[PDB]
Amino acid sequence: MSLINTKIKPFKNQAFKNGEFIEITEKDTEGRWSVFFFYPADFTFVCPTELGDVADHYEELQKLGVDVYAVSTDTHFTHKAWHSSSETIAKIKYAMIGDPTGALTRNFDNMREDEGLADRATFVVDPQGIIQAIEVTAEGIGRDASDLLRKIKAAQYVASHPGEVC
Amino acid sequence: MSLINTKIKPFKNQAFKNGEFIEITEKDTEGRWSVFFFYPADFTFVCPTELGDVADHYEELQKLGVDVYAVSTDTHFTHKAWHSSSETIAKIKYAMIGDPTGALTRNFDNMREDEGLADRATFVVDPQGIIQAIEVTAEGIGRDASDLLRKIKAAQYVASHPGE
Amino acid sequence: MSLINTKIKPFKNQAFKNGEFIEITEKDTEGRWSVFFFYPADFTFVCPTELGDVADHYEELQKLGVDVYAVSTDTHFTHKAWHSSSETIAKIKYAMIGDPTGALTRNFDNMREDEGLADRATFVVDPQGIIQAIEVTAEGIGRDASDLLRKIKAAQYVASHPGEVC
Amino acid sequence: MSLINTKIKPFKNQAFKNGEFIEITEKDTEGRWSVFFFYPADFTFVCPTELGDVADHYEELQKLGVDVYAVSTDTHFTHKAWHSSSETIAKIKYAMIGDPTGALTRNFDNMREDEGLADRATFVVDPQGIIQAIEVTAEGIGRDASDLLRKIKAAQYVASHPGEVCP
Amino acid sequence: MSLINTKIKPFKNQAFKNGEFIEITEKDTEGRWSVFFFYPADFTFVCPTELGDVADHYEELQKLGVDVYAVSTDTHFTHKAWHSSSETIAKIKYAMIGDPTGALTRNFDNMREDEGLADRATFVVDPQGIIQAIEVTAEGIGRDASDLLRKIKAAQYVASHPG
Amino acid sequence: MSLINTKIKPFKNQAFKNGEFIEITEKDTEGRWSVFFFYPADFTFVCPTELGDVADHYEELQKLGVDVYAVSTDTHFTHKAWHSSSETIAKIKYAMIGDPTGALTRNFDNMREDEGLADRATFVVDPQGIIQAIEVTAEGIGRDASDLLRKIKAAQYVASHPGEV
Amino acid sequence: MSLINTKIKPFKNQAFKNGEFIEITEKDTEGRWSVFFFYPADFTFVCPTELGDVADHYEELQKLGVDVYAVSTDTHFTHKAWHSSSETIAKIKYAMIGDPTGALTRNFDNMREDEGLADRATFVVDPQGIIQAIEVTAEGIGRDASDLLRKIKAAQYVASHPGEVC
Amino acid sequence: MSLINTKIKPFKNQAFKNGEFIEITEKDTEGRWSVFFFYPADFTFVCPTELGDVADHYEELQKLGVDVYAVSTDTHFTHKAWHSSSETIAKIKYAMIGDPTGALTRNFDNMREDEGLADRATFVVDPQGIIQAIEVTAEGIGRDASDLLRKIKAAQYVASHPG
Amino acid sequence: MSLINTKIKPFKNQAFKNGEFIEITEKDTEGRWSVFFFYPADFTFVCPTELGDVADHYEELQKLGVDVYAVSTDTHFTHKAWHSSSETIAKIKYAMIGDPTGALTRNFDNMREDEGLADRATFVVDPQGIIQAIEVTAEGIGRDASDLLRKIKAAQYVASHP
Amino acid sequence: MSLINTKIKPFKNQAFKNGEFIEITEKDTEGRWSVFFFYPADFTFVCPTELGDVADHYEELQKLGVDVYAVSTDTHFTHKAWHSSSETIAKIKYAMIGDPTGALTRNFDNMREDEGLADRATFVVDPQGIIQAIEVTAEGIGRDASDLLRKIKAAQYVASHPGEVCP
């Protein structure tokens, strides 16, 4: 099952966003660009650098009409604690979805079954819910947030201008 | 169906114990009394009072030759953070087993499937690996550690002295 | 795969309660707190002490609006004889449910398959039929009735006060 | 579920490389870094700019010790023609693997079933055959060759330095 | 699928006999005539008359080399209590097998599924383990122990005397 | 999975009764006490002492309102010949049901599959069609018809006196 | 399946032959011509005329080296009794095989399922066990024994003279 | 099991009858006595003597009210050629059915599977479609047409006159 | 089982015809004679001589009322490129259907599974959709277009003269 | 799935050939070129013209080392009679296979199931048993023997000359 050019499945998760807890579903992603940013676990060494880089470009992403959704198999309670504890996480103004069931992770075909943790994968989704770009990496290899912007800018261009001349 | 009077299944989990990570297996529970103390999640309101009450009786439990294994579906990385953050958790000198896969939790038939978290349950296991007592409770209801000691002492008595 | 926070399954068993035989069903437990007190068999040494300790606290339980149901694989005819012969059993004013088919014992996942007897297990059930507390013990270990009252009084407090804890 | 951190499956495909036809298998990728670069079809509009960008960095990729394998459902005969006709494809000095059966494309879960063409997907494979980085995009969106070099250089660093990890 | 002229299946039940508990299996019945006397439950009104009638003829059955096995879905603990309380049960010197699992009863296809009790059934078994006679009745109809002796004596005659 | 206290299955068999052939079905048994007296074969040497003993008590059985049905895998044509030949069969006034198909026999779970003959079994059936007593025996062992009357008289009592014995 | 030119199946049946019981099997037919004369039941009106014909021609059949086996679903005990009573049956010196199981009748594909009786069929079998001729008729219609001999003599001719035909 | 006293199955085959081709089905056999005379193949040595015999008695068969159907696995085109060439076949007035699919042959359980031909079988069928007589023989043994008449006359007698 | 005297299955394939791309379906073949001319691949040595031979007789075919459909596992884009580069392919005025999914090829039981290419096979179809003639050959063996016309003229005769 | 470039299945049929009956099996076709010329039935109108046209070129086919096998669902007995009756069939010297079971016909996927006859199909088979050319036609349409020779001469060339290919 290649997920590229396919509609995202429904979900119902608890999240953390700017101090308060909130519920986030597939209804909230409708009519807007979305970025489902998966990562293995909280209180790890590589994850804060990736999430912190997306936080630096979040003003730029919000201007383009793009929501971000940080996802992992930890609870929404853990994300609140990690936000206070870590400095690079504290600057995150976007939602941090908790996925203890692994349902949201299994919808995007991104769980490490033997570990019970989500792989390092980023999914760019359009207003209609269709997955326009995927980027999966190994445990050590980091994801650049400047390339993610280039992909969203490119995805937005082709949506607005289908079948461009060359 | 019932897990009472059955042998515990094999497992392999990472855990946090006294400022250091370790791997814990069924081999580490052999030949000793064990307590698998399940709970839903870290950074919650009810768990610290339960885990803290067992931490206060850990001096007494170690004297009786009893190991304690706190278990939940959070990672072993999360248990290190919660130990540093919370004060009632900081006094826990026993192992805190991380179970992201939920394998250990599903071995003890103690998983909330729709929540992805372990239920509040305590399992007393003897040196041979046989489950001698099970306690399970709802979200609001707390578990008393003095009642756990009463059952472990009763379980130890009948093991050494059958038929009275 | 846990019976905690799940609705009890329907049943139809014959029982003994204060010198007469009666039929008890899941309909009888509706709209009331219930305690299903399983034990292996009649005419044993450890069971009278457990059942006698609950019999001492039955005035307090009936005060709190709680019905007690002693269950074993033995017949309702046997419960009438054990009530007459034994002195610690004679003080039981609550129902002794017979379960020769093992249907009630299997509904609560509490049957010793190779022995054909119920395990020592107590189930606290609320007015809606949801199991709020379980307590299973080995053959040698005894169950404390004072601890049972704490869990019922705890369970009643959380139901009456939603969004609170103990 | 997820092809990340899994071994590549065996294959046998014909390919065009520097004016001659050759057979390529999984044995050829053993003990080496390999990039499997999937794309829809030859004689299309967006595909040559993507492939041409990787051709500009092939001097750098060869220096790191990295094979490049361009893959599509077209035949290896078609790749030779597209090499001659198009200017952007002429500069390519890596293998253009034909996959008319779609076996290589299906091994990486990268087929458009109703269309019969491969999706725009890049896979970075290490010496042991393990997929260390995946990159898929929709029909309109183009892949960046400099970003691929970052991920390969990262992957090479993690392999050579156990314990250490790139942010 | 009739059980007449078929070998009995293996079992492993606990039983009460003469003020002590014992394990009984299929190996004990081998090389001897056996009587598997099923009945519904202990502390009932009509079961003591059936069992007590067999207890009167047990002297004659022991001379003929026949073991009696009273079986029900009650526990072997219950059989001890019913022995002390009732006068008609107190004279039983044969084994009272408890079958709480219902395995022994289900081997002889004699279980009431909806009721969880055994039917009133008598099975005569020869030294080889083959069932030579079956007698099953409803829950108001007794079983004559004199008729059971006649069948055992007939079974012993034809077993020894070929054709 | 026994057949005590279960309703009998339907059937259609030819029978012999007092110098004439007749067809007997489950409808004929409705509302009355019936005895299905199975036996292996005709012209055998386990003398019809079983069938003859029931024939001696048939006058008492007809008083109580009990229809006797002697069933076997042999044909109804055979039963007529065995009735004329044998002295002990000649006194049988009750029906002798033939069952060459073995349908009636397989309904009562009484067929010897390797032999193709019925086992020595006696089923007591009540007015509702419910089996109230079973008595199966081995080849050599006979069946006592005075004992059979005790079971029917006991069965009739518990039917007419509910909630007691 | 067409049974003509196919080997007969194995069997084990009891039979009556000249005032004594015997066991007939497929071994006994080997190296000899055999006739399986099926009929519905004993003590009926049509069959004694059929079996009486074959009894008259048995002198000629034994000269040709042909065994006869009169088969039916009635027992071997009945065939004894029918031999004593009826005059036309009393002159049968060949074997009368009983088949209460129906196994022999079902091997020759000759059972009335709803009646539980064999159909009026005659099978001619050669020394190797191969069926050389089949003759089946309805309840009312009779079989001619003079025609059966003409089929046997034709079958014996083609066996001893391969190539030539009748 | 046996086809005696069973209704014939449906069919739809082409046949040769007196120069011209025709189609024959169940509806043609309805309300009339019928004889399905099977045989292996055309242009063989034994077959024309068997088919020549029934051709001689066809005058008597049509008088009684009987239809003959000669059946084989050869085509209806082949039966026309064999009728012209052979003298013994040329006198056949009855319908020669071709059955290349083997559907009619398999309906009467008369196919030798390894050879793909029909066995030498004769099926007498009454007006209702019920098979009243069967007569099968091996390759060498020839069938007698005078016997067939005796069976038909016997079948017509018992049908018209019971008791 | 044989495909002779059976109805063609539904399809939906893109094609190249006289500069512009088009979609062709089973609806387009209805009420007219049709020729499905399969071959292994584009930019090969033997295929231009076969397709060029049919291109020479397309004047005569269009008179008889037959639509030629050249099918292969290559894309409709590839057919346009091959049409521009080669001279023998440039004279083809009939449709060049692309079948990358292999559905049209697998409908006609004409797929080399291990190679992923169509076998050299020609199918003559009538207005009702029924296959009246089949010609399949090996990799080396070429097909003669003069024979194909004889089959079509024979098929058209027996349809009109039953 | 296609039968082109596939090995023929085993068989055992009786055949008529020059006034005598002979058994023919897959063993007889080994190491030689074989033509399985299927047709529906004997004593038909359009079939003699096809079989007679092959009979004319049979001298040339035997020269090239090619055996012809005329197959149909009629018996080998029927073929003898048709060989004597018809003059166009009398000149056939090749084997006329009788297939009343329909085993040989089903091996080549050539049976009309509802009719119980073979379709008009010619199968050219090489010395190794591999089918090199197929030619199926409808009931009305005839098969040219001159085309069949062209396919056999082309098939013989490519077998003996690796590398080269026919136009």
Numbering used by the authors:
A (entry chain E), C (entry chain C), G (entry chain J): 1 to 166
B (entry chain D): 1 to 164
D (entry chain F), J (entry chain H): 1 to 167
E (entry chain B), H (entry chain I): 1 to 163
F (entry chain A): 1 to 165
I (entry chain G): 1 to 162
According to the publication:
The Prx subfamily enzyme Prx1, also typically called 2-Cys Prx, is among the most highly expressed, soluble proteins in the cell, and is characterized by two conserved cysteine residues. We used the mechanistically well understood E. coli as a prototype to construct a chimeric Prx, EcAhpC1-186-YFSKHN, composed of EcAhpC (residues 1–186) and the C-terminal YFSKHN-segment of human Prx 2, to be compared with wild-type (WT) EcAhpC. The chimeric EcAhpC1-186-YFSKHN described here demonstrates, that transformation of the human C-terminal YFSKHN-helix into the related bacterial AhpC confers sensitivity to over-oxidation on the chimeric enzyme. Structural details of the oxidized and reduced chimeric EcAhpC1-186-YFSKHN provide novel insights into sub-steps during the catalysis of peroxide reduction, enabling the transition from a fully folded to a locally unfolded conformation. Together with mutational and enzymatic studies these data unravel the fundamental role of the C-terminal tail as a molecular switch that mediates the structural transition between the FF and LU state during the catalytic cycle.
To shine a light on the redox modulated structural alterations in the active site, the crystallographic structure of reduced EcAhpC1-186-YFSKHN was determined to 3.1 Å resolution. No disulphide bond between CP47 and CR166′ was observed in any of the active site interfaces of the decameric EcAhpC1-186-YFSKHN, confirming that the structure fairly represents the reduced form of EcAhpC1-186-YFSKHN. Except for the C-terminus, clear electron density was observed for all the residues and the resolving cysteine (chains C, E, F, H and J), which is located about 10 Å away from the peroxidatic one. Interestingly, two different active site conformations were observed in the reduced EcAhpC1-186-YFSKHN structure, where the residues in the active site region are clearly defined in the electron density map except for the side chains of F45 and V46. The first conformation (chains B-J) reveals that the peroxidatic CP47 adopts helical conformation, bringing the CP47 in a narrow solvent accessible pocket, which is surrounded by the highly conserved active site residues P40, T44 and R120. In the second active site conformation (chain A), the first turn of α2-helix is partially unfolded to place CP47 in the loop conformation. While in the second active site of reduced EcAhpC1-186-YFSKHN, the unfolded CP47 adopts a lower magnitude of rotation, thereby preventing its full exposure towards CR166′ to form a disulphide. For clarity, we termed the first and second active sites of the reduced EcAhpC1-186-YFSKHN as FFlike and LUlike, respectively, to denote the folded and unfolded CP47 in the active site environments. Because of the magnitude of displacement, the data indicate that the FFlike and LUlike state, adopt intermediate conformations, lying between the catalytic FF and LU conformation.
